[PDB]
Design a protein around this ligand. Structure first.
Ligand code: LDA
Ligand code: LDA
Ligand code: LDA
Ligand code: LDA
Ligand code: LDA
Ligand code: LDA
Ligand code: LDA
Ligand code: LDA
Ligand code: LDA
Ligand code: LDA
Ligand code: LDA
Ligand code: LDA
Ligand code: LDA
Ligand code: LDA
Ligand code: LDA
Ligand code: LDA
Ligand code: LDA
Ligand code: LDA
Ligand code: LDA
Ligand code: LDA
Ligand code: ZN
Ligand code: ZN
Ligand code: ZN
Ligand code: ZN
Lengths: 70, 70, 70, 70, 70, 70, 70, 70
């Protein structure tokens, strides 16, 4: 609901993103997210960005797409 | 549309490109574009190149490919 | 006939394939090809590799599978 | 079997995975595998990880997803 | 006092650092910093990291060294 | 003169600067320059920036610092 | 010391190196090392290579050079 | 005598120099050199370039200036 189905279906909060597709210092949101705006608000708590990644687990560098409505 | 569906589906005007994969100084076109001609002309306004990138938001370096219809 | 029908059904000559599914610097064959041997010979004219991609037009990076009878 | 049907359907033992979708130094399992745990155990014989890649042939770097239940 | 004299003498708060020498999404601290610990505390307010960069002005990507005592 | 003595003592007009220390597409000023403003004005004739680089010869990419008072 | 003074003055044990400039999977040596022999032996404990890097803190990818005395 | 005295006073043969001051893949000349012409000829034996660096020992990346009488 906050991320599209398929490859980039895992929501994560990352310190930043490079090249338009790589999230850096990513972590699963600390709490549940229900929509684009809430997703963005949770990540902003730690100064992070909302991204939709290919992996369900935290990672220093993961392929991720920009979030929609975030 | 002006960009293929999938990964590189985001139109952007970039100052240049390198390695045939990375656009530099990229920002969303100032106005709507409906075909390869529009896309090329609009980006030329700032002397930029029309590219199809992996992210819908401006960025200094993004993975991008040359627009096919322009 | 040179490429399986479906997703990767468009023959192209690419400088190389990476990550097992991405063709870089791809272009439509200069001449017509009717079988694996033709595909290989026509692409080899420019030091290219024969691949079956999803897109009909040329592209600096496309989703492609190695040609069947390369 | 041990990998879902589709693009990422080829079992491989790779030294590791980066960006959450790329296996490095991948090789086909030496022996057949029948389930997650089995797949994992075999790849562990060479200190490798069990992944499902886009190609049936070994490669220094390939697109792969982690094996389910492995 | 928070950064060494020379090339990397400009304190900045950045979203992260790559390759051990490149700060990403950097900005001059919002307030004055007097020591390593205070520098680190100010940057942590926005979830940023304390770095010593070659430029006195904010930048999306700048050469920066890890901070000492931070 | 317009650049400090030492490593970064060679005046150049470069299309731009990245990472806060690298000038791209640099060329020696067409005419002599005597101070910050002068240096800047000249480089502006070709849409370039005034920088102090480590080498007296033009280059696609060189280590350079911004010109003081320019 | 074990690493030259300057930019690459931080000893680290890394899983490997690429392009003769980037160390991968790097962490500070578990114990003190006073020369090239110590450095090499200590890193061998985890099958790692002794490198001199630009950052004093562990990281998955850092700019590093081979240790001269090891 | 082949390199100016001081900082960059150690002759080395490097695959190339980048950014106007960095020698990559540098090694001490195989034979002795007594003048610019010798330096150039001895390095050219391995397709290398003659540079004057700060370090006496070999290195994958060092601070170097182009040889005076290359
Ligand atoms: C942010 C990660 C960027 C990784 C970039 C990796 C580039 C690899 C280029 C390999 C080129 C190999 N070859 C044989 C064509 O020279
Ligand atoms: C950075 C390398 C990126 C390669 C990206 C390849 C994207 C392929 C998208 C294919 C979409 C195919 N189809 C039939 C669904 O339109
Ligand atoms: C390093 C980037 C790799 C990107 C790989 C992208 C694979 C996309 C596959 C899309 C398949 C779509 N359908 C629509 C499922 O073909
Ligand atoms: C962090 C380092 C970034 C370096 C970026 C270098 C961009 C070079 C672009 C050269 C473009 C050349 N040309 C002819 C296509 O305009
Ligand atoms: C996931 C981020 C990947 C960034 C990859 C950048 C790849 C650049 C490849 C350049 C290849 C150039 N050449 C001449 C060897 O074809
Ligand atoms: C942030 C990603 C940067 C990727 C840079 C990739 C550079 C590839 C250079 C390939 C050069 C190939 N060749 C044949 C011209 O030497
Ligand atoms: C890990 C990726 C780090 C990327 C650092 C990129 C710095 C890019 C600077 C691009 C400047 C482009 N332009 C057109 C303004 O010259
Ligand atoms: C963050 C993106 C950084 C991109 C850096 C791209 C460097 C490209 C260098 C290309 C050199 C090509 N050539 C023909 C002169 O060897
Ligand atoms: C954005 C797409 C980036 C693709 C980068 C691909 C790097 C491929 C390196 C392949 C090396 C192959 N081999 C056989 C020489 O080991
Ligand atoms: C995101 C692209 C990552 C590309 C990584 C390519 C690694 C190539 C390693 C080649 C190693 C070759 N050899 C002979 C030393 O085993
Ligand atoms: C985070 C920025 C990384 C930038 C990496 C730039 C690599 C440029 C390699 C240029 C190689 C040129 N040449 C002629 C030797 O092939
Ligand atoms: C970590 C050091 C990275 C150095 C990267 C240097 C890239 C140099 C590209 C030089 C291109 C020179 N030339 C003449 C072909 O334009
Ligand atoms: C951080 C290293 C950045 C290296 C950037 C290298 C850019 C090389 C651009 C070469 C352009 C050559 N040419 C013929 C197209 O003008
Ligand atoms: C990523 C390329 C890095 C090149 C780094 C060169 C660092 C040189 C440090 C030289 C220190 C010289 N000295 C005499 C002060 O020891
Ligand atoms: C892309 C990285 C470039 C690093 C350039 C580093 C230059 C260091 C110069 C150090 C000079 C030291 N003394 C001690 C002033 O020679
Ligand atoms: C974000 C992409 C990161 C790709 C990292 C690829 C590392 C390849 C290391 C190959 C090492 C080969 N060898 C023989 C030195 O062990
Ligand atoms: C400021 C970050 C710079 C990262 C630079 C990475 C440069 C890699 C250069 C590889 C050159 C390989 N080769 C074979 C052309 O000498
Ligand atoms: C994050 C920085 C990644 C830098 C990757 C640089 C890759 C350089 C590959 C140079 C390949 C040169 N050659 C001659 C083997 O084709
Ligand atoms: C802009 C730079 C982006 C760098 C992304 C780097 C991903 C590195 C993954 C390294 C994995 C190393 N190792 C040894 C654990 O396989
Ligand atoms: C964040 C660091 C990413 C480093 C990626 C390095 C890719 C190196 C590929 C080397 C390929 C060498 N060779 C000989 C097989 O072409
Ligand atoms: Zn909420
Ligand atoms: Zn139109
Ligand atoms: Zn304070
Ligand atoms: Zn010892």
């Amino acid at each position: 609901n906050v991320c599209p189905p398929g490859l980039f279906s895992n929501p994560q909060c990352c310190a930043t993103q490079v090249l338009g597709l790589i999230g850096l210092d990513c972590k699963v949101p600390s709490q549940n997210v229900y929509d684009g705006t809430d997703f963005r608000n949770v990540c902003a708590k730690t100064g992070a960005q909302p991204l939709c990644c290919v992996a369900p687990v935290a990672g220093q560098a993961l392929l991720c797409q920009t979030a929609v409505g975030a």
